Design a protein around this ligand. Structure first.
Ligand code: CR6
Ligand code: CR6
Ligand code: PLP
Ligand code: PLP
Lengths: 810, 810
């Protein structure tokens, strides 16, 4: 047992054991003779869950009594991952449970692997929401996460013949012990219908009704006895729905399809009706809940003092016109008063600048689905443009650029413009991203209301991303500076005075080696794949995207391979290149990239001459639980997106906190990370945002690079001739064609500097001691990237509430 | 507290209370400050449930050790009703829980009303299966009820404008505390595909796979510590199902629709594909489970010694060819050996003789859905007819009459013929019904294999239908003969020596009066309807059907009304005529009858001259929980189906056990009931089966009755002229037209004798003392109609197992 995992008291271990047996008997209705590991996992989950309820009930009762300002974090995604270990960590029950299960003759780590990931997210945006919930609870904020309870989360990725195959993520199959259905708080949500204009107000009538049933999941703060709530809505059809008879009953599924599945798109907008329904569904149900809670604390002037609504991107942007609809149509407030309340209540966070990810809904869709909201949006736009016109008289083009309504083929509503107009604060997720917002995408808006624009650099929770996934590292750190850093990551700074400490250097390196052995083993157990634990673990895990440039990584791998075949008996630092991530089902290029990766592996991994010097592995079904395993085992973190495309990135922070060195571009949060650790302790390369713009003004011509770089030329010719696809020589024609003629992300432009930088990485790896010393400098300066810091800034600069680290009663 | 409700021990009441509070806290995650009656109901349900698990686990472990012959009761319907009180009754926890909740300041009766009925049945057939499970557990048989877990059971009936409106029975909305999902025992079921004939055997390939997930519900025996299992299958789509992406995920519902809803038809066959899928689904999953359990006890010669499969009607008839498919195709047994095993394992129970209820599936449907089963059925038919041909040489018409395959417009498979051929026993559900089977419908089959035909008169469980719904009556009975009768109903005979006992007569009458007041009150509480508790409670509750002749009851009500208007100041015994029951959604005539009933009420209930002398009420949403309320409060039980149409009837037995006198035809079980109590203690009237046949040979002409009975003529003219439907004068034209020209059930033919008999009933009611004495004679002789007797006969004469009343350890 390690210190950071809590005490294994005599009384508590005994109590845990009896409750474990009670649940196995009464809850699972099983005896030890027929119980399977899954049954044991559930018995443990219910045992741990019991310890939450007491705190959950008093935390909520506490907020009722003290009535603080409530924070409502609206998101269509909450990438939670597993809950068992995280709960034990935050409740200081890990060692006790480890001991108790040990005495029952069970391996707790084996049981934890049985829990299904709650994959209600796609990647960064969803995971961010998860880290935020953890931090808000840890900082004692009366926060509520509101989203959708998807029956099917992000699809499970299978690799067949080197191709990605998707299969339903039936995560609720065996039941979810963490959620508590609250059917008693079911709310009605309206769709379609029409607008009637009577004497005293407009009415939305003849609507189709869908019920929203809430499910509450506890969110425990770190050892402070605070347990907040994440409320996920589930779609239910009313009972007089469609009410020949048989068909009417079967058609109930049409209404319940709203919460059936998560759209698997990462940084891409797909204007489908079902998605719009999901967005309004979560918004409509949540707002009624918010107002209900408010009225139970009618002058809505105090609404903004008791309520803060944070929009995670534009997905829940309809909250703005829905809040207006309710205040104006239902509560009968005058427009101006209602608008004042709305702006002061809502804040919007932008997560990207790539045009294809921007939500622009066709007016005809809103027209049919939400007629009243479309009217309110036109009215908002009207009054907004009147302000623009008055601020910039005669600037007609600005008016059309800022309009919430975009003209053209089909009129569309720019949801981002809607969010800026109806929010008192708009923020980017990293300094460079936030600056880009003010200088480009939202320049006109920043000019009109500069006070609205802020920055809130992303962060990650040190509980799940350090203590939970890397106990060995958390331990050796605690041994030298205590445990306070876990909820005050800035204290890792103190590790700077151990950079020359021989014992520490040795332990840091030892922990990494153990993590690598542990992962190298897992690889063979669950995926029959052998790798050399002594090689440098070069990993790039994140969603497959052209802007992420997994292709640039591929070019390097092929370069390494060609160099080896060129001079076989020459020494080179051994490397295990691991690339993992899911591709959106309809993203063809992303799926071709996955195939290319596996294709490269097929050649490289079986070339006798290469031996154990180079291995290319594609990490299947990358998800939160897998991240917790690979990240602690990585040496090199690949954060190589084209400058200006990765709003922030969070995977980069996870790697930095876990002892991996970073090779990347000055993009997103990488800039601040390098700034914190010092550029000398970072492997920075490639074009800066300015270099990219210069190239765009000049005109990007990939051919130029192809003509001037022999090694690059050789790679393209190998791809084109079928060297990596014998049976299908032209298999990768689309890839080569894109690289050569329409590469929006300038892969070739950063090739030379990338490769060169990679050589510097290999050189440092040859010097174990100095590599580890640089690692210590990174870990020691990663404190700024804790989501506790991020949330503290949101609370103080946007929500107007003070974080607290005071422990609530037991 | 009453004696039959068990002891309210000091230790147990204390234990119950703490566990109630534990569940409210840890299970429902609520505090007393926010708990609603529903939360309290669930806390109690979980508390009671806890007492079942221990016994449930050892009962099943017991069967594993002793390995007795297992009884598998296959049914597409299990009309369970509520489970809370029944569980308390069988566990002798009722008084303790009553006390415990009392001390917690809660009214247990109020909490029981919150439980949703498990309405997984239509009427008699489904309820019979429920009573049987209760009796099999009480008799210590290793029995398993196997069926489908419908998401939506029988629809909830709403009456709007006097018309029936159906609405989804979302009984799982708030969760079901009684079931235990067993996802670990999920089994695959195949559909469609084709048959491949290879060298060594035929193969069923290219099939669509649907998963069957089982949910187990405990079935406690009466105070014997036995807890059997009812396993209900739920349809689940495999995860690589349909696996653009979004659509594939949404289409999973196509496969899961199989267990979505119960077909609401009572005694009517609807040849829909979805229904056929449900039938094979339950059969395929169940048989794999049966064989699995058998192999874990490969000579299948002992299969019939360890397994008995009872087919509740033909709904699960595919078990016969499915068992053959498995034994022949999968286990590779020779046909003859397989057939021997199948016949010795299966037994079939017929529940009706009406042609429209007989299952005849179109060959083209089986051809597409279950190609292999169709081949097996042809093969069975072939060999079967060869036996017929050899037994009755040259009788070509017999061959075509007995064929499992019916020729004509579209070829169909007669499932009843299939069941007779593949079963070692076939039984009717009442003596007269069983005789009718041998003399008519299955005459040819009886001639070929007379040994197969048996009778097993239906019964009802005295636990739910006496002790649970009528504690007051169970108590006064127990006070004079003890409690042993509850599991040995024949002992009620002893009450015969109290027929002249003044105290007993007074108590029996008192209990009835209290039940009537209790019901008259409930009527006003939940349905704002006032009635006179001193009137005779004339009730007919059962599914709406023409053969049940609710119309004959209507004619009498109208007769009573017309007589009163004719002589207003003449005295007549006051009556409250209550009619209730659901009509199948697509059964037009049944829906018109409901409207007629409410229409009669509209006129009769508001006629000043009638006063409180006559009231016509339609009992809305008749279901098991409502039956438990009305039956104990009834004085007169209407069992007036045309002789030969009601196979048995079970509602009739419920009324007899609860102190109501019966007016009915010599049909179904009424014959045996009258035989048991003595015809002098029964109000028998109308045509006997023989009279009906005579009339059919002559030719039924309704006009004749219309011309010779003035009162009848007046009623038809009132209906035709719009007397009961002013705004819509011809509203009931279909009813009159049917009555006059195509009445398959000869309503007019029994009118005169019915009315006359009703006069005899009123006469006896005027003499309280003698009415009650006749009641005592009925209750005292109702013992034969206990399902314990029925099940004991099934066990000894069909399954070959001995019932046991021995209590298993605590
Ligand atoms: C739209 C969207 O999901 N954007 C992203 C992401 N996950 O892709 O949000 C996360 C969280 O802010 C950022 O770190 C990524 O750089 C940004 O692209
Ligand atoms: C088919 C069918 O459900 N038949 C019925 C019924 N419920 O309608 O079965 C029950 C139980 O045996 C019998 O009492 C009824 O007389 C018979 O009609
Ligand atoms: C952290 C995380 C991400 C975000 O990774 P980036 O490299 O910032 O894109 C995505 N997926 C999972 C499973 C994560 O844990
Ligand atoms: C007993 C019962 C029946 C069967 O009634 P019959 O009069 O035999 O048709 C039908 N429905 C319910 C709810 C029952 O309790």
């Amino acid at each position: 047992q390690i210190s950071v995992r809590g005490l294994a008291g005599v009384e508590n271990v005994t109590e845990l054991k009896k409750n474990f047996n009670r649940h196995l008997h009464f809850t699972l209705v099983k005896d030890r003779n027929v119980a399977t590991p899954r049954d044991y996992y559930f018995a443990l989950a219910h045992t741990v869950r019991d310890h939450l309820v007491g705190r959950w009930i008093r935390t909520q009762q506490h907020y009722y009594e003290k009535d603080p300002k409530r924070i409502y974090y609206l998101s269509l995604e909450f990438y939670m991952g597993r809950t068992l270990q995280n709960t034990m960590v935050n409740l200081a029950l890990e060692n006790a449970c480890d001991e108790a299960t040990y005495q029952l003759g069970l391996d707790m780590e084996e049981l934890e692997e049985i829990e299904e990931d709650a994959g209600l997210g796609n990647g960064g945006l969803g995971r961010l929401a998860a880290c935020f919930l953890d931090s808000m609870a840890t900082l004692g904020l009366a926060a509520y996460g509101y989203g959708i309870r998807y029956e099917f989360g992000i699809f499970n990725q299978k690799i067949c013949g080197g191709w990605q195959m998707e299969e339903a993520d039936d995560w609720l199959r065996y039941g979810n012990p963490w959620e508590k259905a609250r059917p008693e708080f079911t709310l009605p949500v309206h769709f379609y219908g029409r607008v009637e204009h009577t004497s005293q107000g407009a009415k939305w009538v003849d609507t189709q009704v869908v019920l929203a049933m809430p499910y509450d999941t506890p969110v425990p703060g770190y050892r402070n006895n605070v347990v907040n709530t994440m409320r996920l809505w589930s779609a239910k059809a009313p009972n007089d729905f469609n009410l020949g008879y048989i068909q009417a009953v079967l058609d109930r599924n049409l209404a319940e399809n709203i919460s059936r599945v998560l759209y698997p798109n990462d940084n891409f907008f797909e204007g489908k009706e079902l998605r719009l329904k999901q967005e309004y569904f979560v918004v409509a149900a949540t707002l009624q809940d918010i107002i209900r809670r408010f009225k139970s604390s009618t002058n809505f002037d105090a609404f903004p003092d008791k309520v803060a609504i944070q929009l995670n991107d534009t997905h829940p942007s309809l909250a703005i016109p829905e809040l207006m609809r309710v205040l104006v149509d239902l509560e009968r407030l005058d427009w101006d008063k209602a608008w004042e309340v709305t702006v002061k209540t809502c804040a919007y966070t932008n997560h990207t600048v790539i045009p294809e990810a921007l939500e622009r809904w066709p007016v005809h869709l809103l027209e049919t689905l939400l007629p009243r909201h479309l009217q309110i949006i036109y009215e908002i736009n009207q009054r907004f443009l009147n302000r623009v016109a008055a601020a910039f008289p005669g600037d007609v083009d600005r008016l059309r650029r800022m309009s919430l309504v975009e003209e053209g083929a089909v009129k569309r509503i720019n949801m981002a413009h809607l969010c800026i107009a109806g929010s008192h604060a708009v923020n980017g997720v990293a300094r460079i991203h936030s600056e880009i917002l003010k200088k480009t995408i939202f320049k006109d808006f920043y000019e009109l209301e500069p006070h609205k624009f802020q920055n809130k650099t992303n962060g990650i929770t040190p509980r799940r991303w350090l203590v939970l996934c890397n106990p060995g590292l958390a331990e050796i750190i605690a041994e030298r500076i205590g445990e306070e850093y876990i909820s005050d990551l800035d204290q890792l700074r103190k590790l700077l005075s151990y950079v020359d400490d021989e014992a520490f250097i040795r332990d840091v390196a030892k922990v990494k080696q153990e993590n690598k052995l542990k992962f190298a083993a897992y690889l063979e157990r669950e995926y029959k794949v052998h790798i050399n634990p002594n090689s440098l673990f070069d990993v790039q895990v994140k969603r497959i995207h052209e802007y992420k440039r997994q292709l640039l990584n591929c070019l390097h791998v092929i370069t390494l391979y060609n160099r080896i075949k060129k001079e076989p008996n020459k020494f080179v630092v051994p490397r295990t290149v691991m690339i993992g991530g899911k591709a959106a089902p309809g993203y063809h290029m992303a799926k071709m990239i996955i195939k290319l990766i596996t294709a490269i592996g097929d050649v490289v991994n079986h070339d006798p001459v290469v031996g154990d010097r180079l291995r290319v592995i594609f990490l299947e079904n990358y998800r939160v639980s897998l991240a917790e395993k690979v990240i602690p085992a990585a040496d090199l973190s690949e954060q190589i997106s084209t400058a200006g495309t990765e709003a922030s990135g969070t995977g980069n922070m996870k790697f930095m906190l876990n002892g991996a060195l970073t090779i990347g571009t000055m993009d997103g949060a990488n800039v601040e990370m390098a700034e914190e650790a010092g550029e000398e302790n970072f492997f920075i390369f490639g074009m800066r945002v300015e270099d990219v713009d210069r190239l765009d003004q000049r005109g990007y011509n990939a051919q130029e690079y192809y003509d001037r770089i022999p090694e690059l030329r050789q790679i393209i010719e190998q791809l084109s001739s079928g060297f990596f696809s014998p049976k299908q020589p032209d298999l990768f024609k689309d890839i080569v064609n894109m690289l050569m003629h329409h590469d929006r992300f300038k892969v070739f432009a950063d090739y030379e500097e990338y490769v060169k930088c990679q050589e510097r990485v290999s050189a440092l790896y040859k010097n174990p001691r100095e590599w580890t010393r640089m690692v210590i400098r990174n870990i020691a300066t990663s404190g700024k990237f804790s989501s506790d810091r991020t949330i503290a800034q949101y609370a103080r600069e946007i929500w107007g509430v003070e974080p607290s680290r005071q422990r609530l009663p037991a």
